[PDB]
């Protein structure tokens, strides 16, 4: 498999040991933008602009 | 530049027709930009003028030279989109305001969305049309009385109507059925208990410029001292806010204990029950056979769920130099100059004030009920609503049972999530968020080489580092000014709420004011006050009817001799071919007396004639 | 020796237009080369975006409080005013009543409120009807579309004007028909007689001058209704609030045309004349100036929301202690002799 690359910004999650477990691309969809704005993987219920 | 006729043949192109109705980028004879063109007939163009400017210096219209036509330029669309997202959903519901769905699916978005519909606010995506269904409360309010509800199953979101309040409907007539009116009168009643929380104080925060802008560097202080007294005003405003909070707390403490007189033979730990009413959950220590700390079970239950209390900040700041766990977000703020100071009065003496204020309404000389015992006081209060005294004097155990049941229900309701604890947590959450937002400003570059004084210092010479330090200084000063402005904006609402709390304590707890719809919801009887983290908790008791009965009444009669009578807080019923009097809140018939109605030397034609009432 | 009943009108401001400002679309540019420099300032837009959210939340909370104060302790009959006679004892109250029956939907404004809502243009529905015309083509000299394209918008409240008008008119019919929830169970003329007896007038004169009281009420209502043709003190504040809001919006929008020490007020000219190595020096001045302007605006909003809340609390207290009940406090609900 092959896929192209580009300079993008991601939100990464580190566990207690130091291994990356979760990653979110902040330019994929609207949920990703909400998670990037809140800097969390489980944002609260609400209406965002 | 970018306006003229001397073109360049370096990068040449081909002339194209001016398209209308599309957001395109133009290169018209030098002037560039993006917009939509529209053809319009104009007759205000001379031979020396070909472009139209606005009052601020913007191209709004122009005229072509090759076609001799006039066009008008309009800017393209640029706006945001609302996204309603639930707790653990997979895709939020989208809402484009003031835009129809026939415009966003072919000019803005190109994704095949199988769910889309127009509304009064605009276009909604990933939702269904369920306007015909109402809802009491919502968490995602859009506007104009519309809400979005998440239902676990198409689209899990539902676009419904928001109706927070209704009106009670009673199936009765409105017209006069033979000169009488059909009204519902209660038959069986009870005592209900409500609770509310009013914020009084605010956390006292102190900031120091000697550690926020310049931590310990001398070259930073040399540039900070050039501005002058720009940092003294911050400390002055903080001290003024702290003094205002202290004065407010002292005024509240004075309003709590004002005229209270208690007996010296009460410190026995046994005088806690009167009229078979349990008040152990409201009273604490009163005397000398206790320790330093003393609260009530309700106050303890309220404080056990709030960690950032008065003693919480002290216990957190104490664990900063030990070595157990210094990774908390409290010591890092104290190491930079932001410190929370405790108030003058502690949460223990205010508990004693509330306990004394509660006892003042239980035992002689009854300094909180004008010298009237508690059962007689509550009986007079419930009689003032328009009930008979006989049913009150005959049923005294039911009143105490209802009081005990309401108190137990209020005590048990704290296990759930009410609005009082919600606000008590929200205030401290907002305070913590403000502190974190103020602390995060120390890691911003503010248009410099690095967001750190050491990296700027040990990378260049002072002549090239002065500007880099000045940028950070200006940024941090602006942040401090914004924080001071926010604190000054919040202290006003804090003081207003505290004044309202003082007024409610003075006119609802210590005294029984005749102001209706002030201490309760029209049927208010009494209220009690307790302490709570950063505020007071008011427990009100109200008169709640249970059963009802329809009855025909008449608002006054006409006696014999051109004289009229009118009821006082009641009605006239016709029972057993005779006119009797009933209360406005109970259905105990009683004969008409002198001290029950009001007389008048003339009666109108609307009153019902009854010349057989010889009760003079 | 002889008396009459006079009428007076007062206006109390309760709400305010919720203004929302977009950061990235206003302070730097609508382009993309400015965001790479704007991201160097850190999280500066978060405070500006949160202040407006807190102000809007406070406005929603106080609006819900006003609604609760208007809709508390109201019990009406099922056979409501369905084209029923809106007069009680020769007292015409049709001018201040809408419709609350099974029919007559999507419209609940009274004829009195129509005269007030027709003299203003920037109402709750005004912004909605003026913002959806920018796509299909609005007026060429329209400023609202430009303000919306620059990131300045006005959001509607959580409750529409029709719902508030219905909640208000549901309280007027309370003390007109059984049961009288707004008069503690006392009929309207008997309540008026009781409230006017407290001044000193005996019942012998009141029981013989009921038609006089009815005619006085009708004449006062007609005069209050006709006084809207001129410019009274009530409409003056309503117009002044909108004028001040529009002036503030225009002053905030005008900041985009300043130089702030740079060579031009538009980034299109700067990016078409200089290179990136000599562009940040010019863009930083504009960024700082617009950030200072936004900070001043949010500070003014935080300063005005306090007075807004104070006025709303005053209105709530007046509603709770003047119309829905009879408070024995002189010189509070009116100018001395208060009857209703
Ligand atoms: C939207 O798209 C349609 C068809 O693609 C086109 O005819 C119309 O001019 C477009 N409108 C705008 C404002 O771009
Ligand atoms: C446009 O108007 C000018 C002014 O008379 C004229 O000289 C020129 O020929 C016109 N061009 C066209 C294409 O009609
Ligand atoms: C109004 O009615 C709805 C629907 O029955 C209900 O959910 C809501 O709790 C009611 N509100 C009040 C204040 O009675
Ligand atoms: C009122 O209700 C209580 C509890 O249901 C009952 O014990 C009492 O007898 C009732 N009184 C009347 C008058 O119905
Ligand atoms: C009535 O007197 C008895 C006898 O001491 C007492 O226990 C009870 O609490 C009193 N009740 C009231 C309402 O005073």
In whole angstroms, give the CA distance from residue B439 to residue B205: 13
In whole angstroms, give the CA distance from residue B121 to residue C245: 22
Which CA distances in Å does B503 have to B198, B492, C326?
12, 17, 20
C283: tokens are 């863009």
Q: Would you say B129 and B98 are in contact if contact means Cβ atoms under 8 Å apart?
A: no
In whole angstroms, give the CA distance from residue B333 to residue B216: 16
β-pairing, C152-155 vs C18-21, is: antiparallel
Sequence-distant (6+) residues with CB within 8 A of B134 are B160, B161, B162, B163
Ligand 4 center–CA B551 separation, angstroms: 20
Query: Using CA positions, which residue lies closest to atom 7 of ligand 5?
Result: B275
Query: Using CA positions, which residue lies closest to atom 9 of ligand 5?
Result: B275
Ligand 2 center–CA B70 separation, angstroms: 13
Query: Using CA positions, which residue lies closest to atom 12 of ligand 5?
Result: B275
For tokens 């979101």, what's the residue?
B157
Q: Would you say B556 and B567 are in contact if contact means Cβ atoms under 8 Å apart?
A: yes
Angle, helices B374-383/B397-412, rounded to nearest 10 degrees: 90
Q: Closest chain C residue to B32 measured between Cα atoms?
A: C268
Sequence-distant (6+) residues with CB within 8 A of B79 are B96, B97, B99, C148, C149, C153
Alpha helices in chain C (DSSP H): 35-38, 45-70, 111-117, 124-131, 133-136, 143-149, 161-172, 188-197, 203-206, 210-226, 233-253, 267-271, 280-318
- DSSP letter at C156 equals P
Q: Closest chain C residue to B475 measured between Cα atoms?
A: C41
Q: Would you say B487 and B223 are in contact if contact means Cβ atoms under 8 Å apart?
A: no
Give the nearest partner residue to A34 out of B92, B141, B150, using CB atoms: B92
Q: Closest chain C residue to B438 measured between Cα atoms?
A: C47
β-pairing, B157-162 vs B128-135, is: parallel
Q: Compute how many other C-beta atoms are within 10 angstroms of the C-beta atom of residue C246.
A: 14
B384: tokens are 């003032």
Give the nearest partner residue to B170 out of C47, C75, C156, using CB atoms: C75
In whole angstroms, give the CA distance from residue C263 to residue C166: 56
Nearest chain A CA: its distance from B95 CA (Å): 10
Residues C38-63, buried b or exposed e (16+ Cβ, 10 A)?
Answer: beebbebbebbbbbbebbbebbbebb
Query: Using CA positions, which residue lies closest to atom 1 of ligand 3?
Result: B166
Q: Is B166 in the pocket of ligand 3 (CB under 6 A)?
A: yes
Question: Where do the DSSP E strands lie in B65-167?
Answer: 70-74, 82-85, 93-97, 116-118, 122-125, 128-135, 141-143, 146-150, 157-162
Nominal resolution (angstroms): 3.3
Q: Would you say C61 and C15 are in contact if contact means Cβ atoms under 8 Å apart?
A: no
Ligand 4 center–CA B188 separation, angstroms: 6
Ligand 5 center–CA B275 separation, angstroms: 6
DSSP string covering C34-55, please?
THHHHGGG-S-HHHHHHHHHHH
The answer to whether B80 contacts A45, with C-beta atoms less than 8 Å apart, is no
Sequence-distant (6+) residues with CB within 8 A of C168 are C70
Q: Compute how many other C-beta atoms are within 10 angstroms of the C-beta atom of residue C167.
A: 21
Angle, helices B462-504/B232-256, rounded to nearest 10 degrees: 10
The answer to whether A47 contacts B140, with C-beta atoms less than 8 Å apart, is yes
For tokens 């605010």, what's the residue?
B202
Q: Would you say B519 and B540 are in contact if contact means Cβ atoms under 8 Å apart?
A: yes
Tally the residues of chain A: 49
Q: Would you say B186 and B547 are in contact if contact means Cβ atoms under 8 Å apart?
A: yes
| Residues forming beta bridges with residue B182, ordered by sequence position | B552
Give the nearest partner residue to B496 out of C178, C280, C310, using CB atoms: C310
For tokens 């980028």, what's the residue?
B25
Q: Would you say B143 and B169 are in contact if contact means Cβ atoms under 8 Å apart?
A: no
Report which of B533, B301, B527, B331 is spatially closest to residue B435, judged by C-alpha positions: B331
- Give phi and psi for C332, each to the nearest 5: -115, -55
Mutate to test the pocket of ligand 5, among B272, B273, B274, B275 (most ligand atoms within 8 A of CB): B275
DSSP string covering B389-411, please?
HHHHHH--HHHHHHHHHHHHHHH
Q: Compute how many other C-beta atoms are within 10 angstroms of the C-beta atom of residue C265.
A: 16
The answer to whether A47 contacts B82, with C-beta atoms less than 8 Å apart, is yes
Nearest chain A CA: its distance from C143 CA (Å): 23
Give the nearest partner residue to C268 out of B33, B144, B482, using CB atoms: B33
In whole angstroms, give the CA distance from residue C165 to residue C162: 5
Q: For chain C, how far is it from start to end, CA to CA, in angstroms?
A: 22
Sequence-distant (6+) residues with CB within 8 A of C328 are B514
Cα B405-B409-B414 angle, rounded to 5 deg: 160
The answer to whether A48 contacts B91, with C-beta atoms less than 8 Å apart, is no
Report which of B191, B131, B165, B557 is spatially closest to residue B395, judged by C-alpha positions: B191
Q: Would you say B223 and B471 are in contact if contact means Cβ atoms under 8 Å apart?
A: no
Q: Would you say C99 and C108 are in contact if contact means Cβ atoms under 8 Å apart?
A: yes
Interface check for B142 against chain A (CB to CB < 8 A): the answer is yes
Name residues 18-37 of chain A within 8 A of B (Cβ). Answer: 29-31, 34
The answer to whether B85 contacts A49, with C-beta atoms less than 8 Å apart, is no
Chains with 3+ CB–CB pairs under 8 A to B are A, C
In whole angstroms, give the CA distance from residue B401 to residue B491: 43
Which CA distances in Å does C12 have to C37, C247, C311?
46, 21, 7
The answer to whether A31 contacts B91, with C-beta atoms less than 8 Å apart, is yes
B554: tokens are 């008449």
B337: tokens are 């100059």
Distance of CA B606 to the CA centre of its chain: 48
Interface check for B92 against chain A (CB to CB < 8 A): the answer is yes
Report which of C313, C281, A38 is spatially closest to residue B504, judged by C-alpha positions: C313
Q: Would you say B120 and C163 are in contact if contact means Cβ atoms under 8 Å apart?
A: no
Q: For chain A, how far is it from start to end, CA to CA, in angstroms?
A: 37
Query: Using CA positions, which residue lies closest to atom 8 of ligand 3?
Result: B136
In whole angstroms, give the CA distance from residue B343 to residue B246: 7
Report which of C5, C3, C339 is spatially closest to residue C192, judged by C-alpha positions: C339
For chain B, the maximum distance between any two Cα atoms, rounded to a whole number of angstroms, is 117
Sequence-distant (6+) residues with CB within 8 A of B480 are B207, B209, B212, B234, B438
The answer to whether B167 contacts C128, with C-beta atoms less than 8 Å apart, is no
Which CA distances in Å does B590 have to B153, B384, B579, B610, C319?
60, 17, 10, 17, 36
Alpha-carbon Rg for chain C, nearest whole angstrom, is 27
Please tell me the experimental approach by which this structure was elucidated: cryo-EM
Q: Would you say C255 and C290 are in contact if contact means Cβ atoms under 8 Å apart?
A: yes
Q: Give kind and range of the element (H or E) at residue B414.
A: none
SS3 C180: coil
């Amino acid at each position: 498999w092959v896929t192209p690359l580009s300079r993008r910004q991601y939100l990464l999650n580190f566990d207690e040991h130091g291994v990356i477990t979760n990653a979110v691309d902040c330019s994929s969809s609207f949920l990703s933008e909400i998670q990037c704005k809140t800097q969390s993987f489980a944002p609260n219920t609400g209406v965002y602009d | 530049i970018n306006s003229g006729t001397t073109c360049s043949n370096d990068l040449l192109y081909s002339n194209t027709e001016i398209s209308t109705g599309v957001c395109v980028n133009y290169d018209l004879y030098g002037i560039t930009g993006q917009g939509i063109f529209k053809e319009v007939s104009a007759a205000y163009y001379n031979n020396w003028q070909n472009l139209l400017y606005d009052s601020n210096g913007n191209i709004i219209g122009f005229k072509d030279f090759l076609t001799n036509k006039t066009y008008t330029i309009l800017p393209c669309y640029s706006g945001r989109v609302s996204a309603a997202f639930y707790q653990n959903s997979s895709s939020p519901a989208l809402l484009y305001r003031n835009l129809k769905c026939s415009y966003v699916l072919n000019n803005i978005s190109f994704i095949s969305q199988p769910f889309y519909f127009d509304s009064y606010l605009g276009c909604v995506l990933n939702a269904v049309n369920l306007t015909s269904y109402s809802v009491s409360s919502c968490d995602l309010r859009m506007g104009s009385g519309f809400c979005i509800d998440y239902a676990l199953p198409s689209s899990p979101y539902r676009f419904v109507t928001f109706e927070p309040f209704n009106v009670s409907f009673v199936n009765d007539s409105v017209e006069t059925v033979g000169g009488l009116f059909e009204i519902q009168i209660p038959t069986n009643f009870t005592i209900a208990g409500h609770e509310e929380f009013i914020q009084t104080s605010s956390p006292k925060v102190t900031i120091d410029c000697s550690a926020f802008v310049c931590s310990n560097y001398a070259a930073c202080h040399d540039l900070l001292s050039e501005y002058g007294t720009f940092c003294d005003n911050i400390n002055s405003i903080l001290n003024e806010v702290n003094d205002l909070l202290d004065i407010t707390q002292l005024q509240v403490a004075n309003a709590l204990m004002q005229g209270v007189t208690l007996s010296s033979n009460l410190n026995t730990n046994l005088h806690s029950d009167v009229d078979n009413i349990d008040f152990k959950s409201l009273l604490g220590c009163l005397g000398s056979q206790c320790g330093s700390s003393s609260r009530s079970p309700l106050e303890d239950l309220l404080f056990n769920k709030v960690k950032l209390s008065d003693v919480g900040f002290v216990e957190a700041y104490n664990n900063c130099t030990g070595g157990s766990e210094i990774r908390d977000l409290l010591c890092v703020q104290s190491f930079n100059g932001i410190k929370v100071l405790p108030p003058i009065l502690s949460e223990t003496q205010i508990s004693g004030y509330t306990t004394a204020a509660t006892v003042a309404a239980m035992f002689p000389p009854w300094s909180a009920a004008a010298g009237v015992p508690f059962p007689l006081n509550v009986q007079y209060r419930i009689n003032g609503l328009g009930v008979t005294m006989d049913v009150l004097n005959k049923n005294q155990k039911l009143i105490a049972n209802a009081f005990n049941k309401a108190l137990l229900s209020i005590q048990n309701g704290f296990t759930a999530t009410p609005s009082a604890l919600a606000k008590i947590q929200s205030v401290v959450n907002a305070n913590a968020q403000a502190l974190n937002s103020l602390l995060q400003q120390l890691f911003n570059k503010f248009g410099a080489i690095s967001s750190s004084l050491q990296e700027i210092l040990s990378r260049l010479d002072p002549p090239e580092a002065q500007v880099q330090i000045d940028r950070l200084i200006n940024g941090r000063l602006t942040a401090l000014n914004a924080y001071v402005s926010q604190q000054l904006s919040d202290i006003t609402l804090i003081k207003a709420g505290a004044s309202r709390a003082i007024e409610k304590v003075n006119e609802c707890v210590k005294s029984q004011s005749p102001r209706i719809n002030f201490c309760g919801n029209g049927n208010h009887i009494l209220s009690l006050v307790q302490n709570a983290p950063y505020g007071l908790l008011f427990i009100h008791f109200s008169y709640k009817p249970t059963s009802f009965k329809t009855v025909l009444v008449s608002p006054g009669l006409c006696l014999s001799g051109d004289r009229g009578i009118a009821p006082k807080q009641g009605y006239f019923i016709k029972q057993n071919d005779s006119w009797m009097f009933t209360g406005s809140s109970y259905y105990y018939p009683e004969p008409i007396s002198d001290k029950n109605v009001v007389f008048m030397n003339s009666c109108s034609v609307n009153f019902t004639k009854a010349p057989f009432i010889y009760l003079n």
